[PDB]
Design a protein around this ligand. Structure first.
Ligand SMILES: CCc1ccccc1N(C)c1cc2c(cn1)ncn2C
Ligand code: NA
Ligand code: NA
Ligand code: NA
Length: 293
């Protein structure tokens, strides 16, 4: 008889499945640890009216990107960048696009409109995002101003999760095997010493990020620039060891210009040598709130 064929099943379109053919590159946004992020328009109607999205893709780190995608898929918070979906062995992460970019780009261009009050509001928002991430049992491991996106003049969001790891249930930290290309000038002593990462290690990193925020991400006042002034620039493979000794002595990044001592004291609580002595994200939120109102 006639040719037999398969009954075509009822198909429901997945709003989180972006077709390669419609995902059109505009420009690069940034690079970060084996991945790169691009501005695209997803333009199924082919008329330049589709939504702008941030697309993360790789240049076996496919496995790491897959875990990152799955972490971000299940994070839902006002101060965490929004997952939109995937474009599919290979895969791309699709996220909302925030035109104002990172705090590293934004703050130097917007000093006049961002006063201390607004800086402290951003600080709270970063803390709420981090306290949410820690309540899901993750350590970020890459908290710096360059990874904080500007949604608006009034709102920031944590914008990349390239290094984010789960902490095991009933355990206090994650041991990092891979520690090359580590942001050492943002890292707590236990991270530099023993490759161990606690929620308190993220609190330390937040202190450094707060410093960046208060200096408006001035390149000449960067945590890297200031620490290398402290320890000596040209030491190469000995740099991290000299950094560790500096922190053991009790030395810390100085008070930002025009930063009130009361704000600096909150920052210093992020930088107690022992993780267990550091402030929490919630106590920081209470601290900033008190200085705001
Ligand atoms: C979070 C900042 C960042 C990190 C790594 C690569 C690129 C970027 N940049 C600069 C970026 C990311 C963005 C963005 C706007 N810029 N909008 C949504 N995302 C994920
Ligand atoms: Na899952
Ligand atoms: Na989500
Ligand atoms: Na733009």
């Amino acid at each position: 008889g006639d040719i037999v064929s398969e009954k075509k099943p009822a198909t429901e379109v997945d709003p989180t499945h972006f077709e390669k053919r419609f995902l059109k590159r505009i420009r690069d946004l940034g690079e970060g640890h084996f991945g790169k992020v691009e501005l695209c328009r997803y333009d199924p109607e082919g008329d330049n009216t589709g939504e702008q999205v941030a697309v993360k893709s790789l240049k076996n780190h496919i496995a790491d990107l897959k875990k990152e995608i799955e972490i971000l898929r299940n994070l839902y918070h006002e101060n965490i960048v929004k997952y939109k979906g995937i474009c599919t062995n290979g895969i791309k992460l699709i996220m909302e696009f925030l035109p104002s970019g990172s705090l590293k780009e934004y703050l130097p261009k917007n000093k006049n409109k961002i006063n201390l009050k607004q800086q402290l509001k951003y600080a709270v928002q970063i803390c709420k995002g981090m306290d949410y991430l820690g309540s899901r049992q993750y350590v970020h491991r890459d908290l710096a101003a360059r990874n904080v996106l500007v949604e608006s003049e009034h709102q920031v969001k944590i914008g990349d999760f390239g290094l984010t790891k789960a902490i095991e249930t009933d355990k206090e930290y994650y041991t990092v095997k891979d520690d090359r290309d580590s942001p050492v000038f943002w890292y707590a002593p236990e991270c530099l010493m023993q490759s161990k990462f606690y929620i308190a290690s993220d609190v330390w990193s937040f202190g450094v990020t707060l410093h960046e925020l208060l200096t408006y991400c001035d390149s000449d006042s960067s945590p890297m620039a200031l620490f290398l002034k402290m320890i000596g620039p040209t030491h190469g493979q000995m740099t991290v060891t000299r950094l560790v000794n500096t922190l053991k002595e009790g030395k810390r990044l100085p008070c930002p210009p025009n930063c009130p001592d009361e704000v600096y004291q909150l920052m210093r609580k992020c930088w107690e040598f022992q993780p267990s002595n550091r402030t929490s994200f919630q106590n920081l939120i209470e601290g900033f709130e008190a200085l705001l109102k």
